[PDB]
Design a protein around this nucleic acid. Structure first.
Ligand SMILES: [Ca+2]
Ligand SMILES: [Ca+2]
Ligand SMILES: [Ca+2]
Length: 341
DNA sequence: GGGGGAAGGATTCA
DNA sequence: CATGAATCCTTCCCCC
């Protein structure tokens, strides 16, 4: 099987460059302003110029400014980025029928049939990069390998603006020398649970009793790592199905007061409903981010679709359940809709 | 013993 | 300082 993975580089910041080309070469930082206080919030995405100095996604906006006070800071414009992304995906579509849109900036292409040899895939890659650079002025990195996981690792190794191929021989070297933490799906949490089992490389996963690895990180994650280490991972390329829609908003200040929280919750519902379009959910979940960044939620599934009126009423009940069962104050509040008809 | 929702939570990552 | 949604896991429940 030959999988070609496309990862748009520093996507949000790059789109801002395309929309304002005079930004090229300057450090650009796209942020999410929380409005709690001047520059309160986090970095969503930073381009290479800012990233090389430590300004990256996740750090506080105030922190970024101490490092690069002269960088260009812009508010995140998600729907603009989504529309540019949609145009890019439809373009990749013309190279494959078999396409898995993993996120706003990532897509896997099963080009097992339209090519053969890693020479022909590579060529299809350089071609794809040119097509996108030309039609949208967006540079992307391409990863090529025998399965989705290594195609992604390939991209991770080659970014930014690159193209890398991981043949069957380096897969085998990587299976022994690649830090397991760099394996897709292994975050800091899992990486630490693995470290305590001796596991630092994929190969190490085969020296452990399965039921032990399973007890430590779960059956699905255990089977996943094992199949990769055995050079047997082979999941098909398929775009997952949109299962839920919702929004969560950060309040100007933490609260525990119903009337103070409501306005934020209702705003979340309105935006959620606008995004659902013609979709009708049978389930609703009110989600709250506590003062200690802990996530709590209460939901309900109905035997029918949920009207906005029912959503407003049910959401208030769910929130009350939350405040009544948790003592912690609330920092962010929102809702999620699922089980579409 | 176990099929099969439903609910609440744990992780991942741009 | 702290900013959408899929997968997966655990517990719980109804009941054959
Ligand atoms: Ca990415
Ligand atoms: Ca990206
Ligand atoms: Ca990692």
């Amino acid at each position: 099987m030959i999988v070609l993975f496309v990862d748009f580089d520093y996507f949000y910041a790059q789109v801002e460059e395309v929309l304002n080309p005079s930004l090229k070469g300057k450090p650009v930082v796209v942020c999410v302003f929380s409005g709690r206080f001047e520059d309160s919030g986090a970095v969503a995405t930073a381009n290479y110029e800012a990233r090389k100095f430590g300004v990256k996604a996740g750090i506080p906006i105030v922190e970024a400014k101490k490092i690069l006070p002269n960088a260009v800071y812009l508010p995140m414009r998600k729907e603009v980025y989504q529309q540019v992304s949609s145009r890019i995906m439809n373009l990749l579509r013309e190279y494959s029928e078999k396409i898995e849109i993993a996120s706003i900036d990532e897509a896997y292409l099963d080009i097992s049939d339209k090519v053969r040899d890693y020479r022909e895939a590579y060529n299809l890659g350089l071609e794809i990069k040119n097509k996108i650079l030309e039609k949208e002025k967006i540079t992307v990195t391409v990863g090529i390998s025998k399965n989705k996981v290594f195609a992604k690792i390939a991209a991770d190794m080659a970014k930014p603006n690159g193209i890398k191929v991981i043949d069957d021989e380096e897969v085998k070297r990587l299976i022994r020398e690649l830090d397991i933490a760099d394996v897709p799906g292994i975050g800091n949490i899992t990486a630490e649970k693995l470290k305590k089992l001796g596991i630092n490389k994929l190969v190490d996963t085969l020296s452990i009793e399965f039921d032990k690895l399973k007890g430590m990180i779960g059956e699905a994650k255990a089977k996943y790592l094992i199949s990769l280490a055995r050079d047997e991972y082979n999941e098909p390329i398929r775009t997952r199905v949109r299962k839920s829609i919702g929004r969560i908003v950060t309040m100007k200040r933490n609260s525990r007061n119903l009337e103070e929280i409501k306005p934020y919750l209702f705003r979340a519902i309105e935006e959620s409903y606008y995004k659902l379009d013609k979709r009708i959910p049978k389930a609703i979940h009110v989600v709250a981010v506590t003062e200690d960044l802990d996530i709590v939620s209460r939901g309900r599934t109905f035997p029918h679709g949920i009207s906005k009126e029912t959503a407003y009423s049910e959401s208030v009940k769910l929130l009350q359940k939350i405040l009544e069962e948790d003592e912690r104050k609330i920092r962010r509040i929102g809702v999620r809709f699922s089980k579409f008809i």
